[PDB]
Design a protein around this motif. Structure first.
Motif, PDB file in Angstrom:
ATOM      1  N   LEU C  24       0.814  -1.198   0.000  1.00  0.00           N
ATOM      2  CA  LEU C  24       0.000   0.000   0.000  1.00  0.00           C
ATOM      3  C   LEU C  24       0.852   1.253   0.000  1.00  0.00           C
ATOM      4  CD1 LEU C  24      -2.640  -0.931   2.735  1.00  0.00           C
ATOM      5  CD2 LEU C  24      -2.728  -1.365   0.300  1.00  0.00           C
ATOM      6  N   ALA C  25       2.173   1.123   0.105  1.00  0.00           N
ATOM      7  CA  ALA C  25       3.041   2.291   0.152  1.00  0.00           C
ATOM      8  C   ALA C  25       3.649   2.648  -1.194  1.00  0.00           C
ATOM      9  CB  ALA C  25       4.155   2.061   1.164  1.00  0.00           C
ATOM     10  N   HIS C  28       2.080   3.975  -5.802  1.00  0.00           N
ATOM     11  CA  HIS C  28       2.078   5.092  -6.730  1.00  0.00           C
ATOM     12  C   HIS C  28       3.468   5.495  -7.186  1.00  0.00           C
ATOM     13  CE1 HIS C  28      -2.107   6.487  -5.103  1.00  0.00           C
ATOM     14  NE2 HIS C  28      -2.201   5.466  -5.934  1.00  0.00           N
ATOM     15  N   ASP C  29       4.510   4.778  -6.768  1.00  0.00           N
ATOM     16  CA  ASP C  29       5.877   5.071  -7.196  1.00  0.00           C
ATOM     17  C   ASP C  29       6.124   4.350  -8.513  1.00  0.00           C
ATOM     18  OD1 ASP C  29       8.272   6.311  -7.115  1.00  0.00           O
ATOM     19  OD2 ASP C  29       9.001   5.319  -5.300  1.00  0.00           O
TER      20      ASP C  29
ATOM     21  N   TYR F  58      14.332  11.401   3.330  1.00  0.00           N
ATOM     22  CA  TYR F  58      12.973  11.125   3.767  1.00  0.00           C
ATOM     23  C   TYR F  58      12.853  11.438   5.244  1.00  0.00           C
ATOM     24  CZ  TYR F  58       8.938   8.212   5.093  1.00  0.00           C
ATOM     25  OH  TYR F  58       7.747   7.753   5.587  1.00  0.00           O
TER      26      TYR F  58
ATOM     27  N   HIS H  94       9.870  16.777  -2.964  1.00  0.00           N
ATOM     28  CA  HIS H  94      10.104  16.383  -4.345  1.00  0.00           C
ATOM     29  C   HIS H  94      11.381  16.979  -4.901  1.00  0.00           C
ATOM     30  CE1 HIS H  94       6.985  13.685  -5.351  1.00  0.00           C
ATOM     31  NE2 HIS H  94       6.059  14.484  -4.862  1.00  0.00           N
TER      32      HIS H  94
HETATM   33  C1  CLA Z   1       0.911  16.470  -6.659  1.00  0.00           C
HETATM   34  C2  CLA Z   1       1.104  15.683  -5.384  1.00  0.00           C
HETATM   35  C3  CLA Z   1       2.010  14.518  -5.204  1.00  0.00           C
HETATM   36  C4  CLA Z   1       2.289  13.461  -6.022  1.00  0.00           C
HETATM   37  C5  CLA Z   1       1.779  13.136  -7.372  1.00  0.00           C
HETATM   38  C6  CLA Z   1       3.226  12.642  -5.336  1.00  0.00           C
HETATM   39  C7  CLA Z   1       3.775  11.447  -5.829  1.00  0.00           C
HETATM   40  C8  CLA Z   1       4.691  10.590  -5.217  1.00  0.00           C
HETATM   41  N1  CLA Z   1       5.239  10.780  -4.003  1.00  0.00           N
HETATM   42 MG1  CLA Z   1       4.808  12.526  -2.737  1.00  0.00          MG
HETATM   43  N2  CLA Z   1       4.383  14.108  -1.424  1.00  0.00           N
HETATM   44  C9  CLA Z   1       3.491  15.047  -1.674  1.00  0.00           C
HETATM   45  C10 CLA Z   1       2.819  15.158  -2.900  1.00  0.00           C
HETATM   46  C11 CLA Z   1       2.793  14.318  -4.003  1.00  0.00           C
HETATM   47  N3  CLA Z   1       3.488  13.185  -4.127  1.00  0.00           N
HETATM   48  C12 CLA Z   1       3.259  15.950  -0.544  1.00  0.00           C
HETATM   49  C13 CLA Z   1       2.296  17.106  -0.483  1.00  0.00           C
HETATM   50  C14 CLA Z   1       4.091  15.481   0.426  1.00  0.00           C
HETATM   51  C15 CLA Z   1       4.197  16.076   1.804  1.00  0.00           C
HETATM   52  C16 CLA Z   1       3.254  15.352   2.729  1.00  0.00           C
HETATM   53  C17 CLA Z   1       4.806  14.332  -0.136  1.00  0.00           C
HETATM   54  C18 CLA Z   1       5.851  13.605   0.438  1.00  0.00           C
HETATM   55  C19 CLA Z   1       6.387  12.413  -0.101  1.00  0.00           C
HETATM   56  C20 CLA Z   1       7.412  11.580   0.485  1.00  0.00           C
HETATM   57  C21 CLA Z   1       8.203  11.637   1.737  1.00  0.00           C
HETATM   58  C22 CLA Z   1       7.590  10.549  -0.419  1.00  0.00           C
HETATM   59  C23 CLA Z   1       6.733  10.764  -1.478  1.00  0.00           C
HETATM   60  C24 CLA Z   1       6.864   9.765  -2.415  1.00  0.00           C
HETATM   61  C25 CLA Z   1       6.077   9.796  -3.705  1.00  0.00           C
HETATM   62  C26 CLA Z   1       6.128   8.784  -4.805  1.00  0.00           C
HETATM   63  C27 CLA Z   1       5.524   7.425  -4.423  1.00  0.00           C
HETATM   64  C28 CLA Z   1       4.830   7.133  -3.097  1.00  0.00           C
HETATM   65  C29 CLA Z   1       3.361   7.126  -3.343  1.00  0.00           C
HETATM   66  O1  CLA Z   1       2.897   8.101  -3.881  1.00  0.00           O
HETATM   67  O2  CLA Z   1       2.639   6.074  -3.011  1.00  0.00           O
HETATM   68  C30 CLA Z   1       1.444   6.195  -2.179  1.00  0.00           C
HETATM   69  C31 CLA Z   1       1.523   6.422  -0.687  1.00  0.00           C
HETATM   70  C32 CLA Z   1       0.526   6.032   0.128  1.00  0.00           C
HETATM   71  C33 CLA Z   1      -0.701   5.359  -0.399  1.00  0.00           C
HETATM   72  C34 CLA Z   1       0.548   6.235   1.625  1.00  0.00           C
HETATM   73  C35 CLA Z   1      -0.785   6.828   2.072  1.00  0.00           C
HETATM   74  C36 CLA Z   1      -0.829   7.048   3.574  1.00  0.00           C
HETATM   75  C37 CLA Z   1      -1.227   8.482   3.876  1.00  0.00           C
HETATM   76  C38 CLA Z   1      -0.006   9.377   3.783  1.00  0.00           C
HETATM   77  C39 CLA Z   1      -1.832   8.575   5.266  1.00  0.00           C
HETATM   78  C40 CLA Z   1      -3.281   9.051   5.231  1.00  0.00           C
HETATM   79  C41 CLA Z   1      -3.652   9.769   6.526  1.00  0.00           C
HETATM   80  C42 CLA Z   1      -4.801   9.133   7.320  1.00  0.00           C
HETATM   81  C43 CLA Z   1      -4.855   7.611   7.200  1.00  0.00           C
HETATM   82  C44 CLA Z   1      -6.124   9.776   6.916  1.00  0.00           C
HETATM   83  C45 CLA Z   1      -7.314   9.097   7.585  1.00  0.00           C
HETATM   84  C46 CLA Z   1      -7.813   9.858   8.809  1.00  0.00           C
HETATM   85  C47 CLA Z   1      -8.798   9.002   9.600  1.00  0.00           C
HETATM   86  C48 CLA Z   1      -9.270   9.701  10.863  1.00  0.00           C
HETATM   87  C49 CLA Z   1      -9.991   8.610   8.742  1.00  0.00           C
HETATM   88  C50 CLA Z   1       5.203   9.360  -5.866  1.00  0.00           C
HETATM   89  C51 CLA Z   1       5.783   9.480  -7.256  1.00  0.00           C
HETATM   90  C52 CLA Z   1       7.853   8.734  -1.889  1.00  0.00           C
HETATM   91  C53 CLA Z   1       8.987   8.418  -2.831  1.00  0.00           C
HETATM   92  O3  CLA Z   1       9.578   9.276  -3.451  1.00  0.00           O
HETATM   93  O4  CLA Z   1       9.340   7.151  -2.999  1.00  0.00           O
HETATM   94  C54 CLA Z   1      10.428   6.674  -2.205  1.00  0.00           C
HETATM   95  C55 CLA Z   1       8.360   9.346  -0.633  1.00  0.00           C
HETATM   96  O5  CLA Z   1       9.018   8.758   0.200  1.00  0.00           O
HETATM   97  N4  CLA Z   1       5.987  11.910  -1.291  1.00  0.00           N
END
Ligand code: CLA
Ligand code: CLA
Ligand code: CLA
Ligand code: CLA
Ligand code: CLA
Ligand code: CLA
Ligand code: CLA
Ligand code: CLA
Ligand code: CLA
Ligand SMILES: CC1=C(/C=C/C(C)=C/C=C/C(C)=C/C=C/C=C(C)/C=C/C=C(C)/C=C/C2=C(C)CCCC2(C)C)C(C)(C)CCC1
Ligand code: SF4
Ligand SMILES: [Ca+2]
Lengths: 155, 80, 147, 202, 39, 219, 143, 146, 92, 74, 74
Positions: C24-25, C28-29, F58, H94
């Protein structure tokens, strides 16, 4: 002169024979229980297990609940137990369609532990058979708890 | 499992083979150092990733590197 | 060898719970998925973009629908200072006698919650004055989301 | 199977047309298991039996002057105890039917008599005509149920009103169903979407 | 309804839609997800 | 407003420092020069060379999320208090009681929270009770995040091993078995779950207090 | 060594009370390891699974679940009692596999009878960047 | 047969007397060939304008009877500011992902992108000084008044 | 002797310390009553379909919540309601 | 009833503190995950990022975790 | 009749006691790591206790979880 020792003369295993397990009263009683019986058919095993569980899942549900103070409704509050045993039968079938996957058959190890065969409850069709028996047994046990709670006499 | 690599800047002190707790690294003969021996890693599938070899490496930078990767039952250190 | 992480054989060959969580992590990478080219990467991004637009339009369509069904928009237009906006209705079998009596606000027949999003002032400013215009516009937004 | 529902539709791979009433329509793949479709088929035919009997069960009383046009039990001669003997006789009869069906399939018999060809009629065409007439009555009984929209009007009576005015006495306008137009709209565009999807995904 | 047809919902709407998405929908979702997670 | 504006400037420069440092030192440092060959989100590079806990970019972003939350909390506290004192015609309250932190804690967090916690008491409840409930719900989520932030994976790995032995050598429950071996969450996963719990609690608690304190005494 | 000593049963195992940390369902469903050594006298050693056990004279054989446990017992016997142990890996089918020492001398010596593997003739720091190895599935170190 | 070329403008924007060295040479291929660079730039612009929306909506209310609704203004301002903070953190995240995943040093040699990387210690150290100054003095003034 | 290579189905721990084998538990013909009763739900798809159709009981059950008289549909009470919430304004 | 509830709260926190401390003492020598924990010492960081991660696996770390739970109990 | 000194003395003595018990849990592990020789302890209480450590920790774990649910869920 200790009551604690290893099992089969080989101590490198984790299970160390302690008084509780060693106890004959505990040994024979656990074997008598409907789940550890291997020769008896799985449908039969499921019905007995479901009867006991469906009956015990009613009382703590009919005494403590949203309508536990309404007299006739309190007896009708035991239906939830039927809904609970329904959810239990659904998750049991879900575990059977995934534990013994079709790809993974026996899963290896014939198991010695004194001259006796592998339980057929661990098969793919055996778990479904058990799921059936548990469903009929739970539904029937809940219905018996509700019927018995109105003609129990001086309860 | 994890990927271990040994670079040519090795001096052959045989400290990583002594620090490895799973018998992954070995010492093969070489002709590029004073000790005439270089480390190797034939049992890479038994690497667990504790990185004790990197702490035992005395040269700067480290001649041996443990790049973590996919995990298996042996690399996850599971006993069950 | 399971088959849930379809995009990664490495996590697919993991005999622990780490396969589920990581499944699930890195979902989207796309830059680190098994057998991915630059053209395939760009096309996958172009598809996910449309999916995001569709869910955005569906979300705003649902907002218009809920305010048109339970919100007192027509009552709020005739007096935009005294009456309070209504988000949606509240249906909870866990609620008690006093919760139902106390959650009813804004001139409603059942329990509702006041809206803090401020969409009533926005719709009243742009021109929406009836309880039907929000309805027809909500079905229009659902149609554009489907497209 | 060669007929097909709308124009030319790719018949589902699971439906080879072996079944006698394979119109080629079977959306969401509800039935695809070899041992499951046979039992579902037995359900469909049993349904048609109860429904066909039902359609002509309401048609007779409705055609003549009587009570119960919409509600049953105006008087009757047995109350509650009747209902108990109804379930008892049916439980015995149904248990026999299930036992018979398991042995050969397509259980068509009364009580315990595996095959019931009293009239000595059982050709292929009659098997098929049973299905098509059952499908028709299952879809006609809903119109008898749809008397709610038409309110006091009964099945024979609803037909009479529709004969008096054919434009202002239909589901599209005279009924309160304005969504029937949207039903026929999506039912008309759906075919084209299936052909479109399959065509695009070359 | 009357002059409001476009998305106007019947009265027992949350009484049959909330008991659906709060128990039936997450149950079928978790069941399909568990069978997909396993082999 | 002078001191609060300086506090806003402090939060902005600190968050920018953490993020800019994690971005510039992402592909190598003097402690780890081949960091670019390890990816973007790795746990560490062992306990050698002094220890390399939280060395990836990260991890740097992970540390900057807390500072971003603190900076946004400061700017919103300032906005809500200035408008909270302007809307009630008591603009002289904030102007003379916003210079000291005790004045902030008393006239802002303690005075405006009188109606929020009174959502449900032993004398009944009111419309604000739902806000009062979620006001405590946010506190519980925040406290659960502190668990994943403080406690690290090794302690939990040994604990899970003891539970495995318990389920294997127990009667009438050894019939079932896990399809996948239970293991503790990873180091990176633990940081992500803790941050998610921390951010969710930080958001829910303030949203409850803001809407309740404003809705409770105003329109 | 000069020939892989085939692991044989009927070896005197050390006297030990029943422990609790060892040989679970994986030791049977998947694999497990076994260490054999030779003891010159009667002593008491510490098992890497709980308490202490004694050393029965003559041959000695112990079974474990992880290779790290056998390696830990191996280094304990080599640095505290000056012994020369050797362990094997038994698979589920029953295929015994020699594991340590493979060359048979010791893993910290040379012996001139092993070929080096997983070596990079370049120095660390001369590796190319992540951008160069894109969609190639390989990595800088792997290249 | 009309219009401008982005690569030509970037290659033509190089000050003489070696102020930036190579200037913006290779930056067009560096930006167009990478996705994390475009994502970081888009997130930085969106995160900045989100805060701009928050700062202008409370001062200049654009909707009728919005200044009277006190909970709506507070909820809208708080919502837009928190959203802007999360997006601003994502922009820098990013940017770090860009530097690790798709930054080849041989392509843009001596330009501004490779030139800002040469004094990263100077940039990080000056940021550290500014942060320490503001922290020490704001905390000291607050504790003194307290 | 503590470890064997061929008869490894007895030296590692593959045992049944609580199971006996017997073809008798329940009385004669009683099992037959439960056999026919449990035959219908004996399969996986059969039981999943049973509980899936029985899942509609919650939907139907909520509709017949009239007997329960749950606070939800009984009323909201016109006499006493929170339409006077806040002190700055009568409604808002 | 409130005295019953708070007394059970006290019993629960005392059991968690004794769990963390007793686990640290009984697993400070050698655990099944890390079989050579005795030779690693008493006060050590971890054993590297292997086995998924072994941070705070030392006996000293258990005392650090315990201190936290003792504060929460008292 | 001096509530300040009463509450103060109770609170102070409680904190000093809790700190000392955590220290006891620390030094027991220090002894087990440094001064534990597996030669003078063959089948005594210390050896048996270290032998069934898995059973001890698993039971304490269950008791802890049960107390938490039944004491905080209320
Ligand atoms: C235009 C927006 C955008 C896009 C297209 C991306 C796209 C990407 N990001 Mg990125 N990012 C973004 C914004 C974005 N990001 C923002 C705003 C942040 C700051 C928070 C980050 C911080 C970030 C980090 C640190 C990393 C990425 C990573 C990545 C890459 C893969 C990981 C992934 O997406 O899988 C999907 C991820 C998930 C499905 C995890 C979802 C869990 C979420 C965060 C928790 C939800 C909160 C909670 C459960 C809500 C419920 C509340 C409850 C009370 C109901 C991917 C290409 C990773 C990477 O580069 O690969 C190593 C990486 O480590 N991003
Ligand atoms: C995506 C935004 C959204 C959100 C967050 C909600 C949230 C909620 N809805 Mg709602 N709903 C929505 C959109 C949304 N709805 C739309 C667009 C419609 C019109 C079709 C409805 C119609 C609706 C009704 C009639 C009811 C709710 C109800 C509820 C509440 C109870 C939970 C529930 O039962 O789910 C809702 C259950 C549903 C089945 C609605 C889901 C709509 C799906 C996703 C789309 C269906 C397709 C449809 C034919 C349109 C095609 C567009 C498609 C191609 C995208 C809850 C607060 C119930 C309530 O208690 O009111 C307070 C209630 O009775 N909703
Ligand atoms: C999210 C959606 C959702 C919905 C719609 C409900 C709905 C309900 N919950 Mg609930 N709950 C939820 C989420 C939800 N919950 C969550 C997320 C939690 C975790 C915190 C809980 C925790 C919770 C608890 C602890 C309790 C409830 C209870 C209840 C019931 C209210 C009390 C009552 O009147 O008893 C219902 C009275 C009835 C007559 C209902 C009977 C109908 C049931 C649902 C099915 C029985 C029919 C049976 C299967 C027949 C089988 C057919 C056969 C022929 C095969 C109610 C129906 C209470 C309860 O269950 O009452 C005992 C209660 O104790 N919930
Ligand atoms: C009157 C003479 C004159 C002057 C004064 C300038 C001045 C300038 N020219 Mg120009 N030029 C001139 C003649 C002149 N030019 C002529 C005759 C030509 C030929 C036609 C050109 C062609 C030319 C080109 C093609 C370009 C310039 C550019 C520039 C600008 C940047 C030059 C530079 O080295 O960057 C500055 C040197 C640095 C080392 C940058 C320092 C960075 C600082 C230290 C960062 C500090 C930030 C810190 C956080 C601040 C805190 C504040 C807080 C609020 C955040 C600069 C303002 C460039 C430009 O357009 O840029 C705008 C450009 O590409 N010139
Ligand atoms: C330990 C914490 C705890 C406890 C003890 C209870 C207890 C209770 N809650 Mg509850 N609740 C809790 C936490 C807790 N809650 C939390 C955290 C929430 C918020 C999510 C709620 C939300 C909630 C709601 C909304 C409702 C309740 C309700 C109830 C009452 C009836 C619920 C029910 O279904 O009966 C119990 C059903 C059971 C199946 C209990 C099973 C008993 C087990 C099997 C123990 C008995 C056997 C034991 C193992 C002995 C071993 C025997 C040996 C041979 C092995 C009940 C007295 C309902 C109520 O109206 O209250 C009166 C209700 O509506 N709760
Ligand atoms: C126009 C309607 C229609 C048609 C063509 C058929 C045709 C058929 N039916 Mg049938 N059936 C119908 C309606 C119809 N049924 C109705 C309304 C009922 C309810 C009383 C039944 C109940 C019924 C039974 C019980 C049986 C048939 C059977 C049959 C098959 C041979 C008997 C016969 O010729 O009649 C023929 C295959 C027999 C069969 O075995 O099917 C293959 C069978 O015994 N039908
Ligand atoms: C960094 C934040 C900060 C700042 C800017 C201040 C500033 C001040 N505090 Mg404060 N304080 C602070 C933090 C701070 N404090 C904290 C954190 C606490 C809690 C511990 C306190 C607690 C506190 C108390 C209790 C008091 C103050 C007081 C004062 C005032 C004292 C002036 C003075 O010291 O006399 C003059 C000092 C000198 C002249 C030092 C002599 C140094 C040499 C010998 C001379 C320098 C060379 C000379 C100028 C010649 C140079 C030549 C040149 C022209 C070329 C002053 C305005 C006092 C006050 O009166 O309040 C107004 C007082 O009561 N503070
Ligand atoms: C009879 C009491 C007693 C004694 C004699 C010892 C003795 C010892 N302990 Mg110990 N311990 C105790 C109680 C005791 N402990 C208690 C009550 C706790 C629980 C908190 C601990 C927890 C503990 C741990 C975790 C460790 C020891 C260790 C040690 C050994 C070395 C300690 C050292 O090097 O000192 C060094 C002296 C200091 C570090 C000075 C202490 C400074 C403290 C932390 C500041 C406290 C602030 C103060 C209260 C307020 C100041 C305010 C400020 C504004 C000035 C040593 C043999 C260490 C060891 O390795 O064992 C072999 C080890 O790591 N102990
Ligand atoms: C509020 C924050 C928080 C919470 C909730 C917990 C909770 C827990 N910690 Mg913990 N911890 C925390 C902070 C927290 N910790 C911090 C900051 C630290 C750093 C010092 C630690 C360090 C720590 C250690 C070292 C250990 C724990 C352990 C435990 C567990 C012991 C279980 C128990 O006995 O009680 C009961 C558990 C609970 C009451 C959890 C709450 C569950 C409630 C009642 C919800 C009920 C279920 C709900 C109705 C279902 C939701 C439905 C939904 C799915 C739709 C427990 C779950 C111990 C452990 O692992 O267990 C043996 C352990 O050793 N913690
Ligand atoms: C006219 C006017 C004026 C002026 C103004 C100006 C002058 C402007 C501006 C402005 C600005 C000045 C803005 C800005 C901002 C910025 C930001 C916010 C940033 C950023 C960046 C980032 C985030 C990065 C990322 C990355 C990295 C990390 C590296 C490389 C790659 C990338 C790019 C991705 C005034 C007021 C006087 C008055 C009014 C009017
Ligand atoms: S993160 Fe954990 S494993 Fe890595 S250095 Fe820090 S303590 Fe050791
Ligand atoms: Ca209009």
């Amino acid at each position: 002169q200790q009551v604690i020792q290893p099992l089969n003369g080989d101590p490198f295993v984790g299970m160390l024979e302690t008084p509780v397990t060693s106890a004959p009263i505990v040994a024979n009683y656990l074997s008598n229980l409907p789940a550890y019986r291997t020769g008896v058919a799985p449908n039969l095993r499921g019905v007995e297990i479901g009867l006991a569980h469906g009956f015990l899942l009613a009382g703590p549900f009919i005494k403590l609940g949203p309508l536990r103070d309404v007299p006739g409704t309190a007896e009708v509050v035991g239906c939830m137990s039927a809904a609970l045993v329904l959810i239990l039968a659904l998750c049991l079938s879900l575990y059977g369609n995934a534990a013994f996957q079709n790809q993974p058959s026996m899963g290896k190890k014939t198991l010695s532990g004194r001259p006796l065969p592998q339980d057929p409850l661990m098969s793919e069709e055996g778990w479904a058979k058990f799921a059936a028996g548990f469903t009929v047994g739970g539904l029937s046990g809940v219905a018996w708890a509700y019927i018995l709670t109105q003609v129990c006499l001086g309860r | 499992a994890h990927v271990v690599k040994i670079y040519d800047t090795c001096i052959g002190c045989t400290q990583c083979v002594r620090a490895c707790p799973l018998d992954v690294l070995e010492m093969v003969p070489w002709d590029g150092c004073k000790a005439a021996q270089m480390a190797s890693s034939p049992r890479t599938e038994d690497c667990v990733g504790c990185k004790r070899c990197e702490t035992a490496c005395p040269t700067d930078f480290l001649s041996v590197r443990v790049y973590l990767g996919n995990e298996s039952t042996r690399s996850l250190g599971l006993a069950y | 060898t399971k088959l849930f992480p379809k995009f990664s054989q490495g996590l697919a060959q993991d005999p622990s719970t780490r396969r589920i969580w990581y499944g699930l992590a890195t979902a989207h990478d796309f830059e680190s998925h098994d057998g991915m080219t630059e053209e395939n990467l760009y096309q996958k991004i172009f598809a996910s973009h449309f999916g995001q637009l569709a869910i955005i339009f569906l979300w705003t369509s649902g907002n218009l629908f809920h305010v048109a069904w339970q919100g007192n928009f027509e009552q709020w237009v005739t007096d935009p200072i005294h009456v309070r906006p209504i988000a949606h209705a509240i249906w909870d079998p866990h609620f008690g006698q006093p919760a139902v009596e106390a959650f009813t606000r804004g001139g409603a027949s059942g329990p509702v919650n006041i809206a803090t999003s401020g969409v009533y002032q926005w719709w009243y400013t742009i021109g929406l004055r009836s309880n039907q215009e929000l309805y027809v516009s909500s079905v229009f937004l659902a149609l554009v989301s489907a497209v | 199977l060669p007929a097909i529902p709308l124009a030319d539709v790719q018949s589902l791979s699971y439906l080879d047309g072996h079944l006698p009433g394979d119109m080629g329509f079977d959306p969401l793949h509800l039935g695809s298991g070899v041992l499951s479709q046979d039992w579902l088929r037995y359900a469909e035919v049993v349904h048609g039996r109860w429904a066909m009997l039902g359609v002509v069960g309401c048609l007779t009383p409705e055609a003549l002057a009587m009570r119960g046009t919409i509600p049953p039990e105006r008087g009757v001669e047995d109350n509650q105890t009747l209902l108990i003997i109804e379930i008892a006789v049916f439980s015995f009869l149904e248990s026999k039917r299930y036992e018979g069906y398991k042995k050969t399939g397509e259980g068509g018999f009364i009580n315990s008599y595996p095959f019931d060809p009293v009239g000595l009629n059982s050709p292929k065409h009659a098997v098929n005509e049973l299905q098509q007439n059952g499908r028709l009555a299952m879809l006609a009984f809903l119109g008898f149920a749809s008397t709610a929209a038409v309110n006091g009007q009964g099945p024979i009576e609803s037909l009479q009103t529709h004969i008096a005015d054919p434009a202002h006495n239909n589901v599209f306008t005279s009924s309160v169903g304005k969504e029937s137009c949207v039903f026929v709209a999506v039912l008309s565009i759906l075919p084209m979407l299936i052909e479109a999807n399959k065509a695009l995904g070359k | 309804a009357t002059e409001g047809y476009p998305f106007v919902p019947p009265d027992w709407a949350p009484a049959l839609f909330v008991p659906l998405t709060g128990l039936v929908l997450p149950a079928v979702g978790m069941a399909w997800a568990f069978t997909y997670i396993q082999k | 407003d002078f001191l609060v504006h300086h506090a806003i400037a402090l939060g902005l420069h600190t968050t920018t420092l953490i993020l800019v440092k994690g971005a510039l030192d992402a592909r190598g440092s003097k402690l780890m020069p081949d960091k670019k060959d390890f990816g973007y989100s790795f746990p560490c590079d062992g306990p050698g060379r002094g220890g390399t806990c939280d060395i990836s970019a990260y991890d740097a972003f992970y540390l900057a999320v807390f500072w971003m939350l603190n900076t946004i909390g400061w700017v919103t506290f300032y906005w809500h208090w200035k408008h909270l004192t302007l809307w009630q015609g008591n603009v002289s309250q904030f102007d003379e009681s916003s210079t000291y932190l005790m004045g902030w804690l008393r006239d802002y967090l303690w005075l405006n929270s009188s109606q929020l916690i009174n959502g449900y008491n032993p004398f009944g409840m009111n419309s604000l009770s739902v806000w009062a409930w979620t006001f405590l719900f946010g506190h519980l989520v925040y406290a659960t995040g502190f668990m994943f932030l403080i406690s690290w994976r090794g302690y939990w790995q040994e604990l899970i091993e003891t539970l495995v032995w318990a389920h294997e050598k127990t009667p009438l429950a050894n019939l079932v078995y896990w399809k996948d071996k239970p293991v503790a969450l990873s180091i990176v996963q633990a940081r992500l779950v803790g941050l998610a719990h921390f951010s969710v609690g930080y958001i829910f608690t303030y949203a409850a207090f803001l809407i309740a304190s404003t809705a409770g005494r105003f329109g | 060594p000069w020939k892989q000593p085939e692991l044989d049963p009927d070896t005197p195992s050390p006297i030990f009370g029943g422990s609790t940390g060892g040989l679970l369902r994986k030791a049977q469903v998947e694999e497990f390891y076994v260490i054999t050594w030779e003891s010159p006298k009667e002593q008491i050693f510490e098992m890497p699974t709980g308490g202490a056990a004694i050393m029965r004279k003559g041959p000695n054989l112990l079974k474990f679940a992880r290779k790290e446990q056998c390696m830990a017992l191996t280094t304990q016997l080599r640095s505290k009692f000056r012994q020369t142990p050797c362990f094997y890996r038994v698979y589920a089918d029953g295929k015994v596999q020699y594991l340590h020492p493979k060359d048979g001398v010791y893993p910290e010596k040379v012996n001139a009878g092993r070929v080096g593997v997983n070596q990079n003739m370049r120095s660390i720091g001369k590796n190319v960047d992540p951008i160069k190895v894109k969609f190639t599935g390989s990595a800088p170190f792997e290249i | 047969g009309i219009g401008h070329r982005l690569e030509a403008i970037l290659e033509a924007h190089t000050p003489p007397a070696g102020g930036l060295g190579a200037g913006h040479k290779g930056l067009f291929h560096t930006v167009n060939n990478s996705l994390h660079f475009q994502l970081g730039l888009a997130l930085a612009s969106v995160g900045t304008i989100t805060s701009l929306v928050a700062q202008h909506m409370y001062s200049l209310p654009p909707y009728a009877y919005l200044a009277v609704d006190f909970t709506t203004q507070a909820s809208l301002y708080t919502h837009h500011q928190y959203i802007a903070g999360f997006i601003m953190c994502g922009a820098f995240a990013h940017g770090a992902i860009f530097f690790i995943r798709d930054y080849d040093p041989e392509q843009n040699k001596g330009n501004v992108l490779a030139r800002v990387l040469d004094h990263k210690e100077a940039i990080i150290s000056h940021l550290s000084w500014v942060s320490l100054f503001l922290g020490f003095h704001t905390l000291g003034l607050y504790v003194h008044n307290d | 002797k503590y470890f064997d290579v061929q008869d490894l189905e007895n030296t590692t721990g593959a045992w049944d310390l609580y199971g006996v084998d017997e073809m008798k538990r329940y009385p004669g013909l009683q099992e037959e009553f439960f056999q026919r009763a449990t035959d219908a739900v004996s399969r996986r798809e059969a039981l999943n379909g049973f509980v899936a159709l029985s899942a509609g009981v919650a939907s139907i059950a909520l509709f017949g919540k009239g007997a329960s008289t749950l606070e939800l549909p009984i009323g909201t009470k016109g006499p006493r309601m929170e339409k006077t919430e806040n002190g700055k304004g009568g409604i808002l | 009833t409130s005295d019953f509830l708070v007394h059970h709260i006290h019993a629960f926190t005392i059991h968690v503190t004794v769990l963390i401390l007793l686990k640290g003492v009984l697993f400070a020598r050698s655990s099944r995950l890390i079989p050579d924990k005795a030779n690693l010492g008493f006060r050590f960081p971890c054993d590297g990022p292997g086995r998924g991660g072994t941070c705070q696996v030392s006996a000293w770390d258990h005392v650090f975790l315990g201190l936290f739970w003792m504060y929460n109990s008292l | 009749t001096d509530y300040g000194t009463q509450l103060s003395l109770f609170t102070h003595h409680m904190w000093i006691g809790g700190f000392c018990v955590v220290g006891a849990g620390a030094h027991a592990a220090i002894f087990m790591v440094r001064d534990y020789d597996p030669t003078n302890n063959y089948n005594n209480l210390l050896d048996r206790v270290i032998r069934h450590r898995d059973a001890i920790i698993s039971h304490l774990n269950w008791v802890s979880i049960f107390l938490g649910f039944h004491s905080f869920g209320l």
